[PDB]
Design a protein around this ligand. Sequence first.
Ligand SMILES: O=C1C(CCS(=O)c2ccccc2)C(=O)N(c2ccccc2)N1c1ccccc1
Length: 472
Amino acid sequence: AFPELLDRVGGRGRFQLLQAVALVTPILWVTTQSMLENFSAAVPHHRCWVPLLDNSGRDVLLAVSIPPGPDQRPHQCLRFRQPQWQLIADTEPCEDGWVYDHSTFRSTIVTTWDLVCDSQALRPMAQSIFLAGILVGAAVCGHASDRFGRRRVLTWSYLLVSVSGTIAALMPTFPLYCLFRFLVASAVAGVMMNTASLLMEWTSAQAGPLMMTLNALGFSFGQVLTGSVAYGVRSWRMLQLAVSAPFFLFFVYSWWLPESARWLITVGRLDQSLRELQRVAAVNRRKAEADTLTVEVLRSAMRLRTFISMLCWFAFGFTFFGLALDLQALGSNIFLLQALIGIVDLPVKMGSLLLLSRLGRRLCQASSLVLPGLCILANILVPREMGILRSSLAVLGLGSLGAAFTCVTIFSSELFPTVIRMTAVGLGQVAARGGAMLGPLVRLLGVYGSWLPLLVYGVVPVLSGLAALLLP
Ligand SMILES: O=C1C(CCS(=O)c2ccccc2)C(=O)N(c2ccccc2)N1c1ccccc1
């Protein structure tokens, strides 16, 4: 009988907007902390240190010192034992360290800890660890908001994000950095889930719309915030601190947001629920029907389609999170990318939804997965000669794939006895977080041809979309 009480106290109004703003604003920095492993763990051009150069015709010295590499470049992992002056066989690996190109980035973790050459596999493992941390933190938090509340967990998760992010920027050794990024990921997942649930609960029956949409926009924009912040600060120690600093103020000001009143009723804290509802009514200025609340009212108040949905969620998560953390391979001028994936995301998603809803729900679901997979696959076919076409296809593909989590959540998830969709969205999204940890691990196939990762990332979504047509 809670919706009757909610209609009695308010609905829409003023408080539901202020709370919405204050709970959606964290989402931008939550995205910023998640896409940060693209300007922090960036790989600049590296050479082998040689005594003849870099102190104790520069082009001639570079030619004699290092053997040439295959890709029209000097070798990045080998060095001549002695200066081969015969150039107007016997090679040894780098042992005095490397030298890097300090022209776009001042200091990355790759530069700091030498995650190049033989120890190349370490880099595509930090992102996998981070995503596994998100999955684990989201799994634990579910049975954590039923014994501690729903607003306290949000504030404590804010504090954990801030402290762990600040501490992770001062570590001198790689495993400590990985562990603290794991903790950051878990706390971020907790923040995500608790914010979503809090936005759902306090809103009236029209929460399915706006509210849930207002979340996504958060990400989209956030993307651009990540891009701008990255363009701002170049060093990697001063990027993590600058990103994790706001969360302390977020935790400080999150001490006044009212806690969800529906949860308080089921546990037995009637007085707190009364105070909460009265203060919400006072904020909403609907202090006319509140006198009816005299405790007693609240005292009396107290299979194939599923598999298709799981496959679609898995394909979307796997492709997006195994391809959008390596944007240095999709083009150039990285700061312009990762800042064009929201400005393309919004118009494309709205236009595609509006245009394809009328044709049919299954048609829209199918067309949202074949198109971006084919777009990504077509990136290989084009050569390097046209860079604009080389980069626009990837942006269009990512923007179109971003519409999947919107189309398959609000328009889909009704493919069931139609009792409540909250038991289906989470079930589908579990495979989305469980398919991203199996993501960047594909990029470990750089050896044995470089086209295989892109080929897999292009064939998986198209196969999932083609299988989606087999509903009957
Ligand atoms: O927007 C989200 C959240 C939603 C959880 S949520 O709102 C909730 C609702 C109801 C009950 C409990 C919790 C999320 O976890 N991912 C995600 C994380 C890791 C891997 C894959 C997906 N994305 C997402 C979607 C598209 C593009 C990027 C990110």
